[PDB]
């Protein structure tokens, strides 16, 4: 089944009547108007393309507006693509709302993680800090040794040292749903999702059986 | 890692930062013009503008609070008597930024500060 695109309102809690304080993430999912439908004849594969949100009419470029005018679809804030499975079908310009998730149980959430910039080996790979005392000099949070001697005489590919945190796509799998409400265009999931408040997300049904 | 963090440190001590912004904000009401560096001018905006709207209402409690900052009596009477009634209609924007290039000593990007009432 195809997924949707939502925006992270933030986080809150839901108080079940039995007494469980479920932590819940509120994902604003405005209805995804379909901008493009692809098939096997000219693309060689089956996928649809949606948009959501509202962009400024001046800032949308002429090729971007030409794509939206062809689809008969008002301009959104972005474009995303979902492959269809066997048996699914969609038409260009049709809308898809929250109510697709009114019967699914587990969903997968995809987003770009919170960027943290250059971070050390202690944070990037949970390297244990050396002795803060007992003679130790200028080497507390350094990664220490990085390789062996003359054989091999080199550092292997994929070796863990410091680098860039965040700002990459990360999928969290098998999150339970709590509420579906197209009257508020909302969606409720137990747990935490990547990204900050107001970020972009992709919500798909879980492939994890 | 500066995530949603506001307020520059300007490579100085915190008390020195408060002391500079205490002194130079007193210069803004004193002469109505300063050519100074651009980052210092942007956060003169963050300290002077709450003071004048605090000086928009005149009371003995407000004068003492306006004396705790800027620590000068002549500044306090100037703040309340003139710019009190002068800025009673302004909803913010009490000053403006006018870039003026760079220094010659160190190439530091300067910019003029300017209360918009001055003509």
């Amino acid at each position: 089944m195809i997924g949707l695109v939502g925006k992270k309102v933030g986080m809150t809690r839901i108080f079940t009547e039995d007494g469980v304080s479920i932590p819940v993430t509120v994902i604003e999912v405005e209805a995804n108007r379909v901008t493009q439908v692809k098939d096997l004849a000219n693309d060689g594969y089956r996928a649809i393309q949606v948009t959501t949100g509202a962009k400024k009419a001046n800032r949308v470029t002429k090729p971007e507006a030409g794509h939206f005018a062809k689809a008969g679809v008002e301009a959104g804030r972005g474009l995303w693509e979902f492959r269809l499975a066997e048996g699914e079908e969609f038409t260009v310009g049709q809308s898809i709302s929250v109510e697709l998730f009114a019967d699914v149980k587990k969903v997968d959430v995809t987003g770009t993680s919170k960027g943290k910039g250059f971070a050390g080996t202690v944070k990037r790979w949970n390297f244990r800090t050396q002795d803060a005392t007992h003679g130790n000099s200028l080497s507390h949070r350094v990664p220490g040794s990085i390789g062996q001697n003359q054989t091999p005489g080199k550092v292997f590919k994929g070796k863990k040292m410091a680098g860039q945190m965040g700002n990459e796509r990360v999928t969290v799998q098998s999150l339970d749903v709590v509420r579906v409400d197209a009257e508020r265009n909302l969606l409720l999931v137990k747990g935490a999702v990547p990204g900050a408040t107001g970020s972009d997300l992709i919500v798909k049904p879980a492939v994890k059986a | 890692m500066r995530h949603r963090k506001s307020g520059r440190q300007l490579n100085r001590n915190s008390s020195h930062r408060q002391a500079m912004f205490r002194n130079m904000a007193g210069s803004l009401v004193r002469h109505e013009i300063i050519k100074t560096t651009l980052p210092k001018a942007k956060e003169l905006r963050r300290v002077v503008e709450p003071l004048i709207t605090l000086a928009k209402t005149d009371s003995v409690a407000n004068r003492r609070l306006a004396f705790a900052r800027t620590r000068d009596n002549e500044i306090v009477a100037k703040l309340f008597n003139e710019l009190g009634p002068r800025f009673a209609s302004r909803a913010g924007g009490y000053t403006r930024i006018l870039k003026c290039g760079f220094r010659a000593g160190d190439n530091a990007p300067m910019a003029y500060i300017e209360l918009v009432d001055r003509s």
Binding site: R13, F15, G19, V20, S21 | -
Partner: protein, 122 residues
């Protein structure tokens, strides 16, 4: 939230007064002990004629802690001190015959029916 080398109070009349936690059984590289889980303790100070003496190695369970225990609604129940209850090393049954001070509710299990019945409160 009890680890190795931890001094612990005692809530029964087994004879101990201050005990030392030396192991957290139930898992390789396990760091901490919550509430109602098996730990191995040694006795550091005892009354003269209790059921146990100084320097014995036998198991115990944690019934109070300063870190607390999280309720499913988000509440937490924490105490001013961390206290334990002695058990026999092989039968896992409590050595003492009384419980001093309240215990929590998450000890309610088939192994600990004796303790909560003997508990004075909660």
């Amino acid at each position: 939230m009890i680890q190795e080398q931890t001094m612990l109070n005692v809530a029964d009349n087994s004879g101990a007064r201050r005990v030392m936690c030396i192991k957290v059984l139930g898992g390789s590289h396990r760091r901490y002990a919550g509430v109602g889980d098996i730990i191995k303790i040694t006795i550091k100070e005892a009354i003269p004629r209790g059921k146990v003496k100084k320097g014995d190695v036998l198991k115990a369970v944690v019934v109070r802690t300063k870190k607390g225990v999280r309720r499913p609604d988000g509440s937490v129940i924490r105490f001013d001190g961390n206290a334990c209850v002695l058990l026999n090393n092989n039968s896992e049954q409590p050595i003492g015959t009384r419980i001093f001070g309240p215990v929590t509710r998450e000890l309610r299990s088939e192994k600990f029916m004796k303790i909560i019945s003997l508990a004075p409160e909660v």
